[PDB]
């Protein structure tokens, strides 16, 4: 009989601008393949309105009523963590497409697809190494994302002998960052990296250029989007950042196995949505589908019947032991005790040139 899969994203509320791409990634996925071992897949979708309490109610309804075997996770981290808790309580695996870190047994029934920030930071620290960087200044948000980037910068740069000379912060809604950037320029670091996201992430770069900074400028994958690019304008020219390789698949060498899968994704996204994709979030949903397709195939070989707790366990067990699954964002290798499955193949460094991201 058929195979039921749950899909929760945000089509309303403050993370709809990510839940909409996520859904487009699900249409691509369906266009690429919609059966496992000859068995059609029935998708059960609900909208969490960017609300975590609603995401958890949605999950319970899919699990208790529709009897889905798995859920492919939602557009924000709060909602993803909410589903993760229902995932554990109901013994139903979750494939999270948002960066959700729930370590230990509490997260035994989830995996997290997006690359963890330290793996992304290490990529641009490696670029600093070959670029002659001996001093780096940091400026980032005064929240958990700013903290995480700076902590990963400490743990990656200091072992490699790069001195961090500034740790300035600012709030997301701040209009000015002049004071902080004045202190950074005075230290004359060889490079400045920021720990930011969205169009507020452009503020420090605009300040550095008005202040006349002629060093290298770095930033995170959260800055890879056309809105940041045009707000940054000339001030972000030459910006170095890590990215999941799908963004620049057409530039990848042929030995990079992510090029072929990324190209399959672009064609399937083209077929279902009418235009080629340019965002990272649709690609995460694709990878989640690829992971489910592969893990389902293996769980079906165990003779456990879909729609039963036993198959839910088989599917979880297959997901969290996946080996060498080539996706658009990573080559996924999962172990039961770790929520993440990305390694150094999960990211490349790009440079912003004439408004385009170029593989370095």
Structure tokens at 168: 């300035």
Residue 199 and residue 180 in contact, taking contact as beta carbons nearer than 8 Å: no
Cα 51 versus chain centre, distance: 20
Resolution in Å, one decimal place? 2.3
Angle at 227 between CA 121 and CA 242, to 5 degrees: 20
Residues before each break in the chain (C–N > 2.5 Å)? none
What is the C-alpha to C-alpha distance for residues 52 and 75, in angstroms, rounded to an integer? 10
Dihedral sign, Cα of residue 202, residue 329, residue 55, residue 270: positive
What is the C-alpha to C-alpha distance for residues 55 and 79, in angstroms, rounded to an integer? 6
What is the C-alpha to C-alpha distance for residues 107 and 251, in angstroms, rounded to an integer? 36
Burial code of 176-188, b = ≥16 C-beta within 10 A, e = fewer? ebeebbeebbeee
What is the C-alpha to C-alpha distance for residues 282 and 29, in angstroms, rounded to an integer? 9
Report CA-CA distances (Å) from 338 to 37, 105, 260, 293, 359: 28, 10, 27, 21, 30
195, exposed or middle or buried, with CB in 10 Å at 0-12, 13-18, 19+?
buried
Residue 188 and residue 214 in contact, taking contact as beta carbons nearer than 8 Å: no
- State whether residue 195 is helix, strand or coil: strand
Residue 311 and residue 304 in contact, taking contact as beta carbons nearer than 8 Å: yes
What is the C-alpha to C-alpha distance for residues 214 and 196, in angstroms, rounded to an integer? 20
Going by C-alpha positions, the residue among 134, 214, 122, 139 that lies closest to residue 176 is 139
Tokens 């958990």, residue located: 144
What is the C-alpha to C-alpha distance for residues 259 and 251, in angstroms, rounded to an integer? 8
DSSP characters over 109-130:
TEEE-SPPHHHHHHHHHHHHHH
Going by C-alpha positions, the residue among 116, 198, 208 that lies closest to residue 166 is 208
Going by C-alpha positions, the residue among 118, 124, 122, 126 that lies closest to residue 145 is 118
Structure tokens at 135: 């001093």
What is the C-alpha to C-alpha distance for residues 325 and 287, in angstroms, rounded to an integer? 9
108, exposed or middle or buried, with CB in 10 Å at 0-12, 13-18, 19+?
middle
Structure tokens at 261: 């899968």
Residue 60 and residue 21 in contact, taking contact as beta carbons nearer than 8 Å: no
- State whether residue 107 is helix, strand or coil: helix
What is the C-alpha to C-alpha distance for residues 241 and 3, in angstroms, rounded to an integer? 40
């Amino acid at each position: 009989a058929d195979l039921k899969v749950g899909f929760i994203t945000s089509l309303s509320g403050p993370v709809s601008s990510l839940g909409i791409p996520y859904e487009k990634g699900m249409k691509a996925a369906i266009a690429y393949k919609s059966d496992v071992g000859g068995r059609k897949i029935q998708l059960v979708q609900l909208d969490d309105a960017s609300d975590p309490s609603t995401a958890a109610r949605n999950a319970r309804k899919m699990i208790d009523e529709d009897k889905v075997d798995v859920i492919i996770g939602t557009a924000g981290s709060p909602g993803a963590l909410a589903i993760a808790g229902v995932a554990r309580e109901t013994k139903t695996p979750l494939i999270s497409i948002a960066n959700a870190n729930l370590p230990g047994e509490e997260g035994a029934w989830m995996v997290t697809l997006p690359q963890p920030a330290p793996l992304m930071v290490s990529a641009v620290v490696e670029r600093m190494k070959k670029s002659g960087v001996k001093t780096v200044g940091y400026i980032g948000f005064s929240d958990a994302w700013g903290d995480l980037v700076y902590d990963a910068l400490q743990k990656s740069a200091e072992p490699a002998g790069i001195k961090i000379v500034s740790n300035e912060r600012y709030a997301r809604a701040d209009s000015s960052v002049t004071g902080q950037v004045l202190k950074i320029v005075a230290l004359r670091p060889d490079a400045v990296i920021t720990g930011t996201s969205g169009t507020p992430g452009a503020l420090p770069y605009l300040a550095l250029a008005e202040r006349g900074y002629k060093g290298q400028i770095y930033g995170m994958h959260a800055l890879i989007n056309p809105d940041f690019v045009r707000v940054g304008g000339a001030s972000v020219e030459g910006l170095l950042a890590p990215t999941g390789p799908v963004i620049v698949a057409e530039q990848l060498p042929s030995e990079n196995p992510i090029r072929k899968v990324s190209m399959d994704f672009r064609a399937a996204y083209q077929k279902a949505n009418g235009a080629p994709p340019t965002d990272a979030f649709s690609a995460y949903t694709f990878d989640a589908w690829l992971l489910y397709l592969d893990a389902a195939q293996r769980a079906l070989a165990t003779k456990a019947e879909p729609g039963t707790p036993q198959f839910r366990l088989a599917l979880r067990d297959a997901i969290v032991s996946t080996k060498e699954l080539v996706g658009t964002h990573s080559v996924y290798n999962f172990k039961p005790t770790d929520r993440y499955g990305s390694d150094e193949r999960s990211r490349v460094v790009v440079k912003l040139e004439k408004g385009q991201w170029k593989l370095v």
